């Protein structure tokens, strides 16, 4: 088969050390790996009133960036499966993997 792995996080340093962890766990265990590719980063904006009572035109603008990385895996061995299910990832990376 191919197994597809999506990574999303709020930081880009933390997300591509996490991809570097899973591209090098996967041909250390001996599989061709496809990627990693950066998908477009979805940025969500917010705009608040800062004053407790009036003054409409005084505002702040904030943002959350969600970075995305995609790795496809070519050669899903038995050794490859038990390697990258038991890996030491950080608290900021969300993983959702595809069969």
């Amino acid at each position: 088969q191919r197994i597809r792995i999506r990574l999303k996080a709020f930081d880009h340093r933390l997300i591509d050390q996490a991809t570097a962890e899973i591209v090098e766990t996967a041909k250390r265990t001996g599989a061709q790996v496809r990627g990693p590719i950066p998908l477009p980063t979805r940025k969500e904006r917010f705009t608040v009133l800062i004053s407790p009572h009036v003054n409409k035109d005084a505002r702040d603008q904030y943002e959350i960036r969600t970075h995305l990385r995609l790795v496809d895996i070519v050669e899903p061995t038995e050794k490859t499966v038990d390697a990258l299910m038991r890996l030491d990832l950080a608290a900021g990376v969300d993983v959702q993997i595809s069969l």
Binding site: F46, Q61, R65
Partner: protein
Amino acid sequence: AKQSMKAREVKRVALADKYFAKRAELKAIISDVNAASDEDRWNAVLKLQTLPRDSSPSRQRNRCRQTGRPHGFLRKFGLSRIKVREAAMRGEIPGLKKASW
């Protein structure tokens, strides 16, 4: 924001989850276009008012979780714009830095 106004809100969502999203059957199934369009649909329209004046998610004012403010709400955070800003500058909301594009 007036302890009773929050208790009115806490009671409203707890009583809304009590009936609706479970027994929305009274209008989503019987008030349909087929052979139930006889008296059984009409008794369904009558039966919908036996349930309390609450129960409906259209009476949720959806206030802030800390202060209980009814205005300036943000559904992403659950907090008012005063408390979103006060906690974002403290670094409490993850990934929320000041936007400048």
